[PDB]
Amino acid sequence: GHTYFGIDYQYYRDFAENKGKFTVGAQNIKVYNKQGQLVGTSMTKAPMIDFSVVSRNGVAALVENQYIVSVAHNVGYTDVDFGAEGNNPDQHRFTYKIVKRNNYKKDNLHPYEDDYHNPRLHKFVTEAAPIDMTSNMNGSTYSDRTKYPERVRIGSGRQFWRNDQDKGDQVAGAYHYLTAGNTHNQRGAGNGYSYLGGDVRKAGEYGPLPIAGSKGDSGSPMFIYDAEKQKWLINGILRENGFQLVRKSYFDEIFERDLHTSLYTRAGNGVYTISGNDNGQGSITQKSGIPSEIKITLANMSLPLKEKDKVHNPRYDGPNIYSPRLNNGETLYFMDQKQGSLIFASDINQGAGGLYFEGNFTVSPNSNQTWQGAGIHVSENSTVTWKVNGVEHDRLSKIGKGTLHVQAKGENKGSISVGDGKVILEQQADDQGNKQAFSEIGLVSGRGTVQLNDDKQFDTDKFYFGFRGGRLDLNGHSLTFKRIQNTDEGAMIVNHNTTQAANVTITGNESIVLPNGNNINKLDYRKEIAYNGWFGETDKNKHNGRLNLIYKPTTEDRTLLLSGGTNLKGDITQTKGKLFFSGRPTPHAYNHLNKRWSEMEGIPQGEIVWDHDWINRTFKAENFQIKGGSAVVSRNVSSIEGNWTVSNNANATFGVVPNQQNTICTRSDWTGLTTCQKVDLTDTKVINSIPKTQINGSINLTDNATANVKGLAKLNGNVTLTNHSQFTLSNNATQIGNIRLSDNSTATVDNANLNGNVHLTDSAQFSLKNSHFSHQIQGDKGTTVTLENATWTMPSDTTLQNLTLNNSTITLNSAYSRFNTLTVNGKLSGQGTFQFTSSLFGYKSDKLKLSNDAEGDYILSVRNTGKEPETLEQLTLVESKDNQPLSDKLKFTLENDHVDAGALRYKLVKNDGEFRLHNP
Amino acid sequence: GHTYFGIDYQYYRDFAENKGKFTVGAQNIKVYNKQGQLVGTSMTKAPMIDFSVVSRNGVAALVENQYIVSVAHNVGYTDVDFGAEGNNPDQHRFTYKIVKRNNYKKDNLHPYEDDYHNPRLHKFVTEAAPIDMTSNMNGSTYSDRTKYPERVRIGSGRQFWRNDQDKGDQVAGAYHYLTAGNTHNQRGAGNGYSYLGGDVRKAGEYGPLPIAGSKGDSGSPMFIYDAEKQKWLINGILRENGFQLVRKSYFDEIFERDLHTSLYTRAGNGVYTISGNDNGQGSITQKSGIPSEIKITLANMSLPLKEKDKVHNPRYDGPNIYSPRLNNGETLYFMDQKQGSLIFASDINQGAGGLYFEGNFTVSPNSNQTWQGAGIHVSENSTVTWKVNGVEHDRLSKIGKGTLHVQAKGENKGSISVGDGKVILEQQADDQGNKQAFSEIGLVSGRGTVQLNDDKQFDTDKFYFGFRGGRLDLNGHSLTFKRIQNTDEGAMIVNHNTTQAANVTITGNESIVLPNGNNINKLDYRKEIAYNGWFGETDKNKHNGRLNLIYKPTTEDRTLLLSGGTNLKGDITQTKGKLFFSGRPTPHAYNHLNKRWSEMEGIPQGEIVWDHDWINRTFKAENFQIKGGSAVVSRNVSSIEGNWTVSNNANATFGVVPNQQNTICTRSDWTGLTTCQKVDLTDTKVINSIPKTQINGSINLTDNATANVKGLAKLNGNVTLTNHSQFTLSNNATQIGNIRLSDNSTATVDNANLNGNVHLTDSAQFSLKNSHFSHQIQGDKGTTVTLENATWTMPSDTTLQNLTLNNSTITLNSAYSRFNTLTVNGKLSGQGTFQFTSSLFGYKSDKLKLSNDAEGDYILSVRNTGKEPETLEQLTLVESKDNQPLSDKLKFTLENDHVDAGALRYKLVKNDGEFRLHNP
């Protein structure tokens, strides 16, 4: 298509991929031109369309579970696929095959032009919900912009951008990638058609991003928003541009041709028996109803797998490939109001025919009969007990809001894609002890759930969350993964069991030594693995059962990246390796442009990632037990909630520091690869975009554990240390809470803000560097407090043991800028300043109480109020803790050399073993 | 004398010592016999006599400042002393020496019998005010019992008690101790005499305790109450018993013989110059008046210190010792209406002559002249500026209501006894820098005041409050004591300065290791010291200036007992050791009886202390700052008022517990020694005699501080706790106020009554054991409430975090014996009962809202009112705080298994994650 070079190409790419700000449902997206000026606001009258119904190759759209729409003259393509762009193998993109083209035939009862077809696919599509069609064939219907306020199109035809002189550069050939936007303005319409066209340089009546089609865009879909229904509908297919309106009545004729057999037993508890053979002939016997026997059509093996379909217009001649063998199968519809039964008397290959179930059914083999077909659709509130195995190298498609309770015997060699509703896994062991539900299991489209009703149902290496994921409900069971295959934040691991807890263990990749051969999956041999999804249920109306997460790699050099979220009623445990809690870059459409046009556009080749444009995440658990290795809470984490226990030689670090390098872990949407690397955080825009992490919990360090809260982070909780643990608050981070040190632990506040109190015992040490502190410090026998380049404003009477000063100032009383005393029971040493307040009139003041061990060089500064004393006494400033005299190694100097209280001049003297203010 | 064995000997002993109920001024003292029957009521028509005017040896009474009265035939005694019984060295009892006997000579102008003398003492007596004499010599005068309703006597003659057969046991020899009571009945009187006599077994016209004299009682005084004057007067001296009436006219002749020189200058501003020499010759020069020179007599050193006085009756021959040398001195009287002057041109030794000053005087040495004499009497409203030093080993006696402003130079080696009025200390340093007002200073008789007008005026170890004490007015100055020498509650330390605060520091005894040598003062080497007096002014008409008290011993094992009172405008601070606020046993006369007669009387040998008979005390300060050590409020403290702050590892304990041992601190009146020891409190009479201490203030605990209110105590205030402080209310004590816990503090109510609310935050804990509680408890994140063997009746909606039950019951609503909800946001656990009220008719009830953490075994009891429901619903009783279901570890059981509302039967079920009342 043709875009406007006056607007960033990225808009049109993001639009098509539902990336950047154009996520599904989003509204009011501002669109600026290259001059940074507002062109318009997008999607002000409709939630952003879900383009997942459009095939990756842009030439078709999903209008039913196994049907697409396109132009007949697209005579070459034989299949479609869906989902997100890229080559991340976790996605397991599926190739849906056309088995019947359904090229329109113009005739007395089919008035419209024959460049139009409704292909049937060989499987039910699971990755996306089909889109409804508009029903009126009069183009004028859709001109009303109150009823139809938004209109969009999308395609992969030859790509151009046009400048202000309307000159086009062709930046890509057809079928390379998708571009999209709103359509051009309404430009004339009639029976079966509509024309849209206008000036790409200009904002249109459907929005700031008008886009026209070109060679290769034929067949691509055009969508219209019905504001009354609140639905996006497909309105037409591209044939300025002309569109052939969609044909709902024609589609109905195709559909009813493939689905015409309804099995139903009026009294309920129907019993049906099915059999067939390789020549595509089949039969369904109904226990009692008349007729007892119903003939059905199945996959016909005597027919070619490929053949040339009907061609009704000589212009649209070409390969026109279809599958007479698969298309022979009809779709069956079973309804029962009580408990129905379906018995497999023989293997069944339905070909492109599928199964719909309305009501509960028990489906059972007489022996070991298998099934194979388009897929299974189970109605809302219906449960289908499925006791029939599948076929090797065949994928079963499960759709519908209902439940599929899998309960066949032995090792099922078929796989499954769970697009909608629920699949319960409960395969039974065979006589030989073999038990496997599927050889491979995927959750896609976010609508589906896999629920475990037994152990050892599948190989966890063969389970994946594909495009938009879904729910894996452990239902009280436990699993171990090496790595979890996942594509995005749609991935959810939960436990809906109210009664039994569940555990997920992640062990990381077995080896990081590359194998040989010619189909290496690099994801399996990397030190870094990642999970983009959720642990724990976020839906308030679903049960968030107990769920624990354990990261237990084999080697110290293995990383697990969590970039989605946790809502765990349970703990997260780390035994080794590296564990990152992180936000992630906002997704953006990949840049397919060559060197030249990339340079013209001013964007890098390949992956588009903006350092200032990240998604913010939240994490929550009951406890974080870091028993070993290293846990890191990195950038764009809004909050992490739960209590921390770091033990042995483990470590936990919170926050990234502006103007330094930080290790940043990100996974590529394009390859699925995770990369951890030191990155400079120096850009103002980037720095300002990163939230200060709210750490909502307390921290306990034991043994040799270390914890570090730094930079863009705020600890909303206490820290407790024992043994030889160490805690550091630095780089302008903040803590709202207390620090409690025992044994041989250590704490340090380096250029940071501790809003709370410190309490040491035993041999603990507290260090305050390059900071100001205005709270309480309590230290007893054995403990050492140290200040360096620091100021401390004491709030009240305080006791310490040893205290070491170095270019630091202690203000004894908050009134300096009723009276307090600092007692140093142990050794004071070093050099610095003490700031005093006093009332010479009452001969009262702040006090510094020292022991025989005191020593060093200090400055005394005194602020006195009010009156001149009505008597002559001495005011003690520095005294001994008892009657012994202060050391001669102790040296004090009064600032300004003297203190005046009216006409009375006091100086500093060492008299009788103490330092007093004296009047000569 | 002779007492009645039918009445406790203690009455007669207490009477003589003004102890038990017979304190000075007391009235209506009931006297019971050994059969517990009322014999009579004592002192119904006069306030109890002050026997302090009677010499300790019982043979004389104080009739003027330096004169006594007795019989001439008492020819052996050479001195007298006064005060209280016992050997407490703090009393510094003084030996007053007879310098002239003044044996009566019968002649034409002296009609009466010559067994009578009026001894002159060498010093003015400071410990007691002299008593007036009756003036009529006709014995019949005093028979009128309307005018003279009360009459008493006292002596130390041979001691007997007589039984109902009037048989005497002699229980002690003469001159061992004093006994006293009212006199016998009037039995004949004439010129110069009176006889009193009757039956000791019987109550007499002067009261229930008639007492007769015996051998050794000769000379002892007999007193009569003049009801018109409202005075006790001495009426006669003992010679059934005969008494020689007192001779007022004879005494006047003696007095005028010794005091006949009045110095006076009509125009005011008189100027007198005094000199003398060793031969007892002296001179006073008057500036201008005629004659200019007046001869005076002084101590005559050429005369013997001892000699035999005049003997007028050969029967009364014997030693008759007097002091011709001291008696030679005459007393001088100086009056001036403006400002008079007295100049010492030479040292002066007045001997037994003293000084009276009426009006203001300046008394000055030309050089370093000293003075020595009987004492100084300064008139009311007169000030005598005294610039003359004293003499080593000589005590100066200060009496009169006027002021003595001491302002001499250098180190005065004399001491002083301040009996009356005011002495201001302002010694000036000499050229060499020596400065000392007196080598020793005592306050006695409660009438006197020492006021400090400078620092370093005396050694605080040499200052004492003797018999009945007096006021030490710090007047804005500060002092430190090791121990304060004090005898009784007459001791007062105050600060009358309206402008400058004052501090008293008490440090305790320097060492507790006994010295060697043969004059050890045990009081100086004990761990326990005590102060029987007051801190702060109690007189409303005097200024109660700011005064602070600091107890700061060196070692943890040192105790300070305060058994008197405080009324401090200021604080009490404790840094270490043990501090007791206590009442004290009522004083009782010491038991001098041997083994035999003690056993007969049924009383212990030695000190008489009754465990049920204690004096109740009050204490008041602004703040009690217990910064270290232990503060204890012990038995017989009516109230202690002020706010408490207990910090560091300090402790404060209130109340004694019935039926347990309590540490009781008491000081012996007899030895001055303080003893602290565990004592069982098991006697009903003792228990009932102890008041419940009203603690009138609030309590703040910080750091590791602990406080304990228990037993006979009531806290009328709030408690606030921080850090790791702990507070316990136990043993049936009561608190009217709230408890507020923060940080890691803890509170417990063990079998006690908390009338108020509890509020926890952070990690605080509240424990309720073996108690019933009916007020509010509020606890948020982190906090734990615990009940053991307790019931709690919630008053309104309540929120807690964690809650632990153990054999305890929570009644959700006060109506159980409009609806309330208890929310437990955190973990509930344990076992117990919840009592509910409900209205099934409206489907409303009390609620228990729990979280996922809830667990344990509980009983649900439900009381329902009124109607049968006109609809069928479920009534939720126990619910979740949100949509998650309650744990399976949570178990409830409905009491009685069911609830009925008319014909409708509801049972308890767990339905949909909640516990509801359900109708099958």
From Swiss-Prot, chains A, B:
Its EC number is 3.4.21.-. The keyword Amino-acid biosynthesis does not apply. The active site is at S218. Keywords: Cell adhesion, Cell outer membrane, Hydrolase, Membrane, Periplasm, Protease, Secreted, Serine protease, Signal, Transmembrane, Transmembrane beta strand, Zymogen. Residues 1-253 form the Peptidase S6 domain. Disulfide bonds: none annotated. One of its GO terms (cellular component) is periplasmic space. GO terms for molecular function: identical protein binding; serine-type endopeptidase activity. GO terms for biological process: cell adhesion; proteolysis. Transmembrane segments: none annotated. Probable protease; promotes adherence and invasion by directly binding to a host cell structure. The signal peptide, cleaved at the inner membrane, guides the autotransporter protein to the periplasmic space. Then, insertion of the C-terminal translocator domain in the outer membrane forms a hydrophilic pore for the translocation of the passenger domain to the bacterial cell surface, with subsequent cleavage. This is Adhesion and penetration protein autotransporter. The lineage of its organism: Bacteria, Pseudomonadati, Pseudomonadota, Gammaproteobacteria, Pasteurellales.
